[PDB]
């Protein structure tokens, strides 16, 4: 199937408590591979995935250089954001950045990303065409103007369709036995009555990779949102994930309901019935 | 006019005495790096910083050391300088996009002894009576010789004002002693004008050469005059036919 | 910046167009910048390229083909003033700028009225030396270093008198030796047979 590479950087302001905290992390289809913590002692870009420790010193010296730079970059961005939104130097703000490329089965480029967010809100971002930007508001439009003149767009674009993809392809090959595995989720049904006229049926999804999966409930061959609970997909911690769906069922009416599991590690979609 | 500023511009030193070339940048550029350029080797990167407190050695970092405590400055330190560290140094900075802007550069020469330092001998040669009769144009020939190191700026001044039209300064100095490491240098420039102009004895021609030598600080033991940073000139006046 | 940079200093006559083609390695590359540098001066950006195609700017045009992996720069209406070293930039090594082979451009000026000749410049009260000027020869001629070690020659240079729309090439020759004369001055140089020698 397709794949993805993502870079998440986070800068939070600490007025009076020094320099803003910076954290950067990178993934490969939900698999973390590295991270960078401004307040850590190492002061370097560190490994988080086994197949990524085989890279040369040059590699780490670089990544660290760039990431360390970026931190200061956004450190500066924050100082400006204040001015743009005319905010006081007393509060604390947040600046997130999203950088990533997606590839198809053929390993050929499919899509690129590079967006910013201030205080968790959309700021400015690169469009699908990778030729123009999208400014969330008046402030974002002022920076858009500058990057327009700077020809930033075309830079990114090329980087994405280039550097990113090749790096991605390389990681994929380097982490073959791990990244290209497709674990099928293990399933089971649990039953707990809540009253004399009701009971709960939870459909469980265990040990699946990747995280993308769909758990749907049907009453007599019809989907149902009414009286259903859906948890956010959760990480098992050993690399696999978990998630479940529950439905409030009238007692003795357990068999009318069917649980449907959809995941690319499944040849055929699974159906559970108590 | 905002640029990369390198100080100083020119420099002479004895093997050993440490030094530091500063590089200032008022463009708020997060990227700053140093390059050395040598004949036949082109431009080489020594160290580069993507942002403050961020440092990474370039292709040829040995003998060089840097610091990125501030964004505006990116100095280059040479603890124990070597003759082979004699070269043309450049400081670049990039921001918007990734386009870099270069400082005007710094010429450094590491000699084993400052006794090797020599100012230039400037002499100008009057046009050929033959040249005027045949071409009706007059060409003067400025000649700067025996100076070490290769740090000079030549210019022609006519009647008190700088000249450019009709001048051709050699692009690069000439190693008088090609086979010697401490060879002294030489350079020439030409100024061609109307035979009419030259035949006017009221016209004043002066060749000026800027010499970047030692500072009023460095020691001097020799008898000959201290080869300090100075300006030497040579003149000639119009000659009636 | 290794072996097989297109051999020799590109040579091109006045008014023509110059073509600089260079192939690179790191496919990671995705953005290139062209810089022009005059002999003793600092390099200077003159062209920026990012998307696979063409980019124009007056007499300048840079082409980029990431498929074949080649960078190009083209100058229309070449001017002598354009003789310089041109090289491409591309941060690839994970943060640094790598200056691929820099090509040297030589724009032959067009000497409309050739009048090859070697004059003997009047000595100066100040100096002992005697100087011979070989000027007005055609851009077709190449000057060569003297045979004798104490007789120096400078390579051709091009001067332009904008008022008289006249440009002339020229080379200087000087010595303190009594052996030296303007007739034997450039014997080790293939000069026009039509070249003049005064009195």
């Amino acid at each position: 199937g397709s794949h993805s590479m993502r870079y998440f950087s986070t800068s939070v302001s600490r007025p009076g408590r020094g320099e803003p905290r910076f954290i950067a992390v990178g993934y490969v289809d939900d698999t973390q591979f590295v991270r960078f913590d401004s307040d850590a002692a190492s002061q370097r870009m560190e490994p988080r995935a086994p197949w990524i420790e085989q890279e040369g010193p040059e590699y780490w010296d670089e990544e660290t250089g760039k990431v360390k730079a970026h931190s200061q970059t956004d450190r500066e961005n924050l100082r400006i954001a204040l001015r743009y939104y005319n905010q006081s130097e007393a509060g604390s703000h947040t600046l997130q950045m999203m950088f990533g490329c997606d590839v198809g089965s053929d390993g050929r480029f499919l899509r690129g990303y590079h967006q910013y967010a201030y205080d968790g809100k959309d700021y400015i971002a690169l469009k699908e065409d990778l030729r123009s930007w999208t400014a969330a508001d008046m402030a974002a439009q002022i920076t858009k103007r500058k990057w327009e003149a700077a020809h930033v767009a075309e830079q990114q674009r090329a980087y994405l369709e280039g550097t990113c993809v090749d790096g991605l392809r390389r990681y994929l090959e380097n982490g073959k036995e791990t990244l290209q595995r497709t674990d099928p989720p293990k399933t089971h049904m649990t039953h707990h009555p809540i009253s004399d006229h009701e009971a709960t049926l939870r459909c469980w999804a265990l040990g699946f990779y990747p995280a993308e999966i769909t758990l749907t409930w049907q009453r007599d061959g019809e989907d149902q949102t009414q009286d259903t609970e859906l948890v956010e997909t959760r990480p098992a911690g050993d690399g696999t994930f978990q998630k479940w769906a529950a439905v409030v069922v009238p007692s003795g009416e357990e068999q009318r309901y069917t649980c449907h599991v959809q995941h690319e590690g499944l040849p055929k979609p699974l159906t559970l019935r108590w | 006019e905002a640029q990369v500023t390198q100080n100083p511009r020119y420099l002479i030193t004895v093997t050993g005495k440490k030094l530091t070339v500063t590089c200032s940048q008022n463009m708020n550029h997060e990227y700053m790096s140093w390059y050395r350029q040598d004949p036949g080797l082109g431009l080489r990167q020594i160290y580069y910083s993507m942002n403050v407190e961020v440092t990474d050695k370039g292709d040829v970092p040995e003998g060089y050391k840097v610091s990125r405590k501030e964004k505006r400055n990116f100095p280059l330190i040479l603890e124990s300088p070597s003759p082979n560290q004699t070269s043309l140094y450049f400081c670049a900075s990039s921001g918007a996009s990734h386009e870099q802007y270069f400082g005007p550069g710094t010429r450094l020469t590491v000699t084993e002894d400052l006794k090797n330092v020599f100012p230039p001998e400037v002499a100008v040669f009057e046009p050929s009576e033959a040249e005027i009769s045949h071409t009706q144009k007059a060409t003067l020939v400025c000649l700067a010789t025996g100076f070490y190191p290769d740090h000079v700026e030549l210019s022609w001044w006519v009647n008190g004002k700088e000249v450019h039209s009709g001048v051709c300064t050699d692009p690069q100095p000439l190693k008088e002693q090609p086979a010697l490491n401490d060879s002294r240098y030489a350079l020439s420039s030409r100024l061609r004008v109307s035979a009419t102009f030259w035949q006017n004895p009221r016209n004043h021609f002066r060749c000026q050469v800027q010499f970047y030598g030692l500072s009023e600080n460095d020691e001097w033991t020799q008898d000959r005059a201290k080869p300090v940073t100075q300006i030497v000139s040579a003149e000639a006046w119009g000659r009636a036919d | 910046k290794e072996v097989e940079q297109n051999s020799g200093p590109l040579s091109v006559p006045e008014g023509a167009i110059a073509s600089l083609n260079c192939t690179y390695s790191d496919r990671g590359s995705q953005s290139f910048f062209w810089y022009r540098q005059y002999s003793g001066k600092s390099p200077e950006l003159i062209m920026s390229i990012y998307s696979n195609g063409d980019k124009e700017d007056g007499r300048f045009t840079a082409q980029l083909n990431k498929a074949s992996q080649y960078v190009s720069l083209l100058i229309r209406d070449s001017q002598p003033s354009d003789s310089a070293t041109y090289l491409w930039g591309t941060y690839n090594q994970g943060g640094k700028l790598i200056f691929g082979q820099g090509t040297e451009l030589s724009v032959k000026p067009n000497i409309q009225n050739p009048d090859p000749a070697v004059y003997q410049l009047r000595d100066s009260k100040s100096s002992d030396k005697s100087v011979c000027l070989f000027t007005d020869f055609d851009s077709q001629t190449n000057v060569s270093q003297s045979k004798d070690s104490d007789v120096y020659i400078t390579d051709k240079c091009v001067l332009d008198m904008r008022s008289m729309d006249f440009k002339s090439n020229s080379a200087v020759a000087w010595s303190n030796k009594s052996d030296f004369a303007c007739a034997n001055a450039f014997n080790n140089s293939i000069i026009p047979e039509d070249t003049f020698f005064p009195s």
């Binding site: 870079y7 950067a24 990178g26 670089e62 990544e63 760039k66 990431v67 730079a69 970026h70 970059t73 500066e76 961005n77 400006i80 954001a81 743009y84 950088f99 002022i142 920076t143 500058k146 990057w147 700077a150 930033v152 990114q156 980087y159 550097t163 990113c164 790096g167 | 708020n28 550029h29 997060e30 990227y31 993507m50 942002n51 990039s94 921001g95 918007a96 996009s97 990734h98 | 990671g28 941060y91 994970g94 943060g95």
Partner: peptide, 10 residues
């Protein structure tokens, strides 16, 4: 591999 994002000031 992370991108060369330096210089991109708001």
């Amino acid at each position: 591999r992370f991108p060369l994002t330096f210089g991109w000031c708001f």
